[PDB]
Structure formats: C-alpha cells, structure tokens
Design a protein around this ligand. Structure first.
Ligand code: AMP
Ligand code: AMP
Ligand code: 3HA
Ligand code: 3HA
Ligand code: 3HA
Ligand code: 3HA
Ligand code: MG
Ligand code: MG
Ligand code: MG
Ligand code: ZN
Ligand code: ZN
Lengths: 433, 436
C-alpha cells in the first residue's frame, strides 16, 4: 500500500510514485476547513500538474487554525493529538489516524543500522504533547524492539536513572537529541561508567531535533566508543522527512512526501538547491498539508551518493545557519561548533556557549583543570585562523554550565501524602513531584 | 466467539468464576517455572503443575522482585518483550516489570473496563507519567484499543504545566481525563486561576478516571462536585500487575478475578483467604513475560464477596494502603483516611482542597489553604469535627492561597526549547545547554 526503499530504479520512477498520489492528496486537503476556505469561489487543484500552482502553507497558518482548522476527517477517526515545541503562547496542533501512524512509524524505522526484536531501545525524548517519544516508541513496537520509555524533561527520569538503565538493561539503541548524548556521557562518568568502554551492548545512537555538524556527530560517536550516531530530520507536523545513510548524509524520504526548496525573496520553489524546506506528505488523512514551509534553512542535492538509495540528500543549517556579524566576520553556530569539536577528544570539551556582540565573540566552555589553558589557546588560534573574529574565550570548571546535581541527583517517584509522622518531610504533601 | 480471554458476563456464579481461573493454572505454572526465579525456587524438589498444587504455592514478596532486578522474573526470550517499566517509590531499589504484545492486550482490556465507556467520540487527556512507569502507556493503550483520541498530557514533564493542560481541557473539548485524585484538584485550582469554573466551563468533560492514592468516598464525591457532578471513576493497580480492580456505577471497585486469582494475606497468622482484611496477593492468569505466583503487593485491603447493587458477580475491594496506618496521638488513633473524610466534609463553598497533617505524640498539626473570608469558619468547623470524631488535641492553621500550592504551578507557561549554543547579544544564553 505504501512504497519501500528499492521500489524505484530511477528519479523518473520516484517522480511517478509521487505524482500518482497527488489527486487523492489534493482531494483530501480540500476536506479541511483551511484549504476549503483557501479555494472557496474558485476551482481547486485536483490533478498532479495543478500541484505546480499550489500556494505554500506557512507555520503561521497552522497557528491561526488552532486547534482543528486543518482537520480533514471526523474526530472519531483520530488516534492521537500533539502540539509542537517552541512558543507555548501560540500552539501548533497536529493529529493522526491509525493509518497516518503506520506511515510515521515506517519512516522513523528507516535506520540503516536496523531496529530488530534483539534490540533494547531507550526512548529519551519527551512524551508530553510532542510526538517525538510516541514516534520512537511506535517504530520500536513496529519492529519488535523492547521499548524502555525514558521520556525527557520528566522529574521521574533524571540522567542518573537513565545511565543505570543504559548499563543494567544492556540497552542496544538510544533516541535523544545530540546535547542529551553528551549529557548522558557526563552522567555516565559521574556514575563511575566510561562511555567509550562500559556499555558493550550499545550498538547505535539515533538523534535529531538540533542542527548537527559532521565534526560534532563524529565526536559524539568517539565519546561512546566509535559506535554509529544515526541522524534523522523531522517535525511534529511532518514526522521523519530524512534519515542518514551508512556514509553519513541524510536522504529525503521522497517516496512518502514531495520535497521542494523555497526562496523566500523570489517566492520560487525548486526541487534542489539552498532555501527553506517545503513538504507535501503523501500518506496522511487527518491533517493534510500542501507545500508546508517548515522554514528550516536547508541545502538539497540530488547528487548520486555512495549508498545508492536513489534519493536526494539534505543538510539542515536551521537557526545554526543565521550569520551574526562580529567586526569584519560573519559567524554561524554551525561553524563555531566545528571549531569547538575539533579540539582533541582528551580535552573533554562538550559543553559550551557563545554570545555575538557587534565587536567580539564571547565564548565559555567546560574543561578539566590540567588541559583548560591548552583548550583556551587552541580554540583561540582556530578562531583566528578560520574566522578572524575578535573573541573573549573563558574555560570553566566542569559543574559550571552543567551542574553536578543534574548528572547525579536521584529522585524518588512519590505520590501525594497528607498525614505525616513527626520526623517526615511534609513539604512533599501536595507538591510531591 | 473468537476472543481468547474472558469478559464480564461469561460466568453466572462464583463456582463458574472459580473454574474459569482453575483451567488456566497448568499453563500459568508451566510458564512460571521458565523464569530463573521460580526454576531456582523449585530446584531439587517437585514443582507445582496442577490446580490442586496451587494451594501449596509460596508467596512472592516485593523484596523478591527487587532481588531479581532486572530480568530474574523473565520467562520468555527478550526478543518477545514489547515494553519495560519500573515502579514508583524508591529510585534506590528499582522494581522491573515487562510485557509481550499479548500481555499488553490483557493490560489494555482491564484498564478499558470503565463503566462510563471509552468510545471513538471521546478525547482522552492522559495526565499521568510516561517516564518508566506504566500508567501513561496503559491509559494510552486502552484509548487506542477503544478508538478514543489520546492527548498525551504526561505528568511531571516540564513540557506540560497545569496552565497548558487547562487550555487543552477547554479548547480541545476533552471528554475523559486520567490522573491521580490530587491532580484532579490541581487542575481545578489551575482552571480557577485561568478564570474558568470547573463546575460549568468544561461542558464536554463527561468522566474523570483516577487511581494511585487511597481515596475516600467523601473526597471522591467532592472531586465530582468540583467538576460539575460528573463521574469520578476509580481503579486500583500496580506496575507489576496492571489494573486489578475497577469502579462499578454504584461506586465500589470490583476485582478483575477473571484475569487473576486474588487472595488476602494476614501477616499475623500468615494465612491466605479469598476475602477479608489484610495484604493484597495476586496471581495474574494471562501473561507470558513476567509470571507471578501469589505476588504480595503488601497493600492493606478489605475484600468483600457481599453482593453490590451493580450485580457484576465479582468481589469488591477497598484499598486503605498507607492511609490506613494509625498514628497514636495519646489515646486516639488518627488515619489519613479519617482526617480526609473530615477535611472534605467542609462545605464546598469554603474551597478547602490542599492540606497536610503531622502526628506528634501529643498533638495533630494540620494546615490547609482557604480564601480569607472563609478561613476562620473552616479552622473552627474542622476543629469541631476532630473533637467530635477523634477527640485528638490539634493545632489547625488556615493558610493563604499560594502557600502550599504556589501560583506559578497553576499559571506559569513554559516554552519547549531545544539546545542553542550561539546567542545574539540581547538573548538569555542561560538556556544554551540547560534548556529544560
Ligand atoms: N536533524 C535535524 N537537524 C536540524 N534541525 C532539526 C533536525 N531535526 C529536527 N530539527 C528541527 O526541529 C524542528 C521540529 O520542531 P517540532 O515539530 O516543534 O518538534 C524542525 O523543523 C527543525 O527546525
Ligand atoms: N485506587 C487506589 N487506591 C489506593 N492505592 C492505590 C490505588 N491505585 C494504586 N494504588 C497504590 O499504588 C501502588 C502502585 O504502585 P506502583 O506500581 O509503584 O505504581 C499500589 O500498590 C497501591 O499502593
Ligand atoms: N525531539 C524533541 C522535541 O520535539 C522536543 C523536545 C526535545 C526533543 C528531543 O529530541 O529531545
Ligand atoms: N527530529 C524530529 C523527528 O525526526 C521526528 C519527529 C519530531 C522531531 C523533532 O525535531 O521534534
Ligand atoms: N499512576 C501514577 C504512578 O504509577 C506513579 C506516579 C504518579 C501516578 C499518577 O497517577 O499521577
Ligand atoms: N494505579 C495503577 C493502575 O490503576 C493501573 C496500573 C498501574 C498503576 C500504578 O499505580 O502503578
Ligand atoms: Mg477518536
Ligand atoms: Mg524485544
Ligand atoms: Mg508497585
Ligand atoms: Zn548515502
Ligand atoms: Zn458494584
């Protein structure tokens, strides 16, 4: 019913797998109050050729239509409801039928390392309204992997507990953002476990949600013993839209969506190049999207890649591509990250932050005491040689940017209690979290 | 014809129920021996295989589940597990439980035994944790079994503060909630703080499912009244057992005895019986991954086989738990359950929801929040109730709202941020790496 990797042998065959779905997709879209309103008074697009004419759908549209302005089915058919991360003030609602969920789960499950019944899969992203935890769990169950629901941002599951679970359950796969990969490495050391040796069953780490350079991705692999760090690109509104190949580039899942690159200035859409990621999902019923602009800054290739899936590649600059002018130079987060994570691994520089002033780059990072002044000097020389920005670099003690208590605090999972003995803490009566 | 597990109405007498149970025990006892824990227990001797042998079977204690952490109780290949969970309470001494896909169908069916129904027309806010504990996953699996739209509210997540849950309750026309009874009061207080009346401004809310705390009928009825007189539907369960009892329309919880053998353990005499007062013992009948033979939850319960007005033909259960622990204060014994009945007997217009007490050898110290006009009435009436019902000496203090339950818990909104490393000059770079 839905295409599989290897169902097309050329870009022309891929294009027809897409084109054949557009009548159903355009018919389903018009069922939603948003698109019915958009094409009121005129004749709607109904054929594949008409799709070239279709107007972009912006984030602002999804926000204006809160909660169910984008809904194309009866609510009786919805399986789950979700809201996006970012501004709580302007919620972005997304919702999925059971059949919508099978497409979502299949796309996440396209992990070049596999997800198997022999896997124990720690899901360490949030389950609170956002889709990310539910998505990894649904893929885990689709493939028969034992799912350990770690959740994230939950008082029930601090880092100390996740490290104990990683070790004691022989976890084989993780799902968490790239910062959480470093947070778990720092929490592992604090629990007396070496990330590079003491987790012999950990075979791959799945990651997304942040702009991630190859330089940082490779260091995260090295920190955890040289195991694969497998990136994907997605959103609450779209699910997974690209996944890594064994060579380390992300390929667009174009059999399940039409991908286009939007120039915001000219307002023109092309199938490759530099611009804003536009997505038309092909296998949705509940929340149809026509050329939804994620507004992520991306470069799409279509270059023949060494893996040979016959899919375009994508690099996600995102916000990390926003140039800040500092004296004569433009610095991006992506370029700073490459310099920070080019420091030797033995310096253990993982946690850092920078502020762009009009005149100077202020940058702080944690490094153990013996190596700190080497690290400050080498990062300074790297910035001089690569950017020529003025900089004030400060090395900090570990425990300064990422406090020791975040790495080691354990928290009992209490329920409300009302009657206490004299020697008990009655501060946990009603505020027990 | 073609469901493999029993449903309400498949037995017409206690004798028929008993045979539905006994017929599963050879499979259950064979599966139990496959686990390292039971194979070790019955090493060197003859293991139990038949129904008659079950009378002989030794209790499995919580301390056994802790000693066996993580997979000493595992009876199948790890390839067959769907999910892994750990219990609430002490993080220092974890209890693991785990379930195959088929184990999950039994769990989901038991939660779904809600006398109010769960239908495709329902929008179901799941407001218990998804972090290792089973509760969020269990409500979500039942929601999907019955076709209800599941809103994963999670609980104890920085992503879902009460202000956001109130907005969701209202704007999505939520029909069903699942959360502990304290969370029901927290949501009511957050609604008021947002300028919404729980008793009128949520017209689509038709029932509230609850568990996890000892809950008196007096408190349960007040929680119903606060939210407009809608049903508050209780169940009783544990991470290791799933749902073991659920409420009937008359307001008592019935044991799901078609899916487990329930026994009451007297710790003093060390005897197991099918009814009475003591510690809840459970033998689940429809699980493969983590077989349990007479697992003692150690919850303090009263099981009655007395007929209820509902007519389901299952024994009822009351869960005293910790709230049944007598603290002696001179000649009087005070229980949480009895204090709760007095606090929630105060008139609803006084708005007393949040309280706490400490047992001193000489005096009961009790504090609660009440609006200013009514506070002195509340202090006096609760004092007279304690004098009349317990005769304990008491120091009762009424507190300003925002004192036990801060305003920021009820109204604070929190952006769901991702890590950022490079900031413009005017931004807060404190959310770089600690972005929670
Ligand atoms: N691999 C990735 N690299 C960079 N940014 C990503 C990646 N995956 C997700 N994102 C970002 O996360 C957003 C998803 O937002 P949300 O739907 O709120 O979870 C995307 O639109 C991107 O801005
Ligand atoms: N309806 C209920 N009434 C009283 N206590 C309950 C109820 N439901 C659950 N519990 C308690 O919560 C425990 C479950 O603990 P856990 O497995 O850690 O979630 C039970 O063993 C009881 O102590
Ligand atoms: N994927 C995520 C999201 O959507 C929101 C917050 C956190 C994450 C993550 O990967 O941890
Ligand atoms: N990165 C994501 C993904 O791959 C799937 C779904 C959501 C996200 C996200 O960034 O939140
Ligand atoms: N059900 C719960 C649990 O098992 C642990 C902690 C909290 C709850 C709850 O109902 O909120
Ligand atoms: N309270 C619970 C329930 O009702 C079902 C399953 C588990 C629990 C729990 O408290 O762990
Ligand atoms: Mg529905
Ligand atoms: Mg498995
Ligand atoms: Mg328990
Ligand atoms: Zn490739
Ligand atoms: Zn009854």
């Amino acid at each position: 019913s839905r295409p599989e990797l290897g169902d097309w042998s050329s870009p022309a065959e891929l294009a027809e797998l897409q084109r054949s779905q557009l009548p159903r997709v355009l018919a389903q879209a018009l069922r939603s109050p948003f698109y019915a309103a958009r094409y009121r008074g005129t004749t709607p697009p109904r054929t594949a050729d008409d799709f070239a004419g279709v107007e972009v759908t912006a984030k602002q549209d999804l926000r204006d239509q809160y909660p169910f302005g984008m809904l194309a089915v009866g609510r009786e058919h919805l399986a789950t409801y979700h809201e996006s991360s970012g501004t709580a003030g302007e919620p972005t609602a997304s919702y999925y039928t059971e059949e919508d969920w099978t497409d979502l789960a299949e796309r996440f499950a396209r992990k070049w390392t596999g997800i198997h019944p022999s896997d124990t899969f720690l899901v360490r992203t949030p389950y609170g309204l956002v889709i990310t935890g539910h998505l990894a769990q649904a893929a885990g169950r689709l493939r028969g992997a034992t799912v350990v629901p770690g959740d994230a941002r939950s008082l029930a599951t601090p880092l100390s507990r996740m490290v104990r679970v990683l070790k004691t359950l022989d976890v084989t796969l993780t799902w968490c953002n790239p910062t959480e990969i470093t947070m778990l490495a720092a929490a592992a050391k604090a629990a007396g476990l070496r990330p590079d040796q003491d987790f012999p069953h950990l075979r791959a780490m799945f990651t997304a949600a942040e702009p991630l350079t190859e330089v940082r991705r490779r260091r995260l692999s090295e920190i955890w013993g040289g195991i694969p760090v497998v990136e994907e690109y997605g959103s609450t509104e779209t699910g997974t839209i690209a996944g890594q190949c064994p060579e380390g580039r992300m390929h667009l899942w174009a059999d399940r969506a039409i991908f286009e690159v939007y120039d915001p200035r000219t307002g023109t859409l092309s199938e490759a190049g530099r611009g804003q990621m536009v997505v038309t999902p092909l296998y949705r019923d509940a929340m149809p999207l026509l050329r939804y602009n994620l507004a992520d800054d991306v470069e799409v290739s279509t270059d023949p890649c060494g893996c040979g899936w016959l899919l375009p590649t994508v690099t996600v600059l995102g916000r990390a591509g926003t140039g800040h002018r500092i004296g004569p130079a433009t610095v991006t987060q992506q370029r700073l990250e490459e310099l920070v994570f080019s420091l030797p691994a033995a310096y253990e520089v993982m946690f850092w932050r920078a502020k762009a002033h009009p005149d100077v780059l202020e940058l702080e990072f944690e490094a153990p005491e013996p190596v700190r002044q080497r690290a400050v000097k080498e990062l300074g020389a790297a910035l001089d040689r690569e950017l020529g920005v003025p900089h004030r670099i400060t090395g900090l003690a570990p425990g300064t940017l990422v406090p020791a208590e975040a790495l080691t605090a354990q928290r009992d999972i209490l329920k409300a209690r009302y009657l206490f003995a004299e020697d008990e803490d009655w501060d946990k009566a009603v505020m027990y979290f």
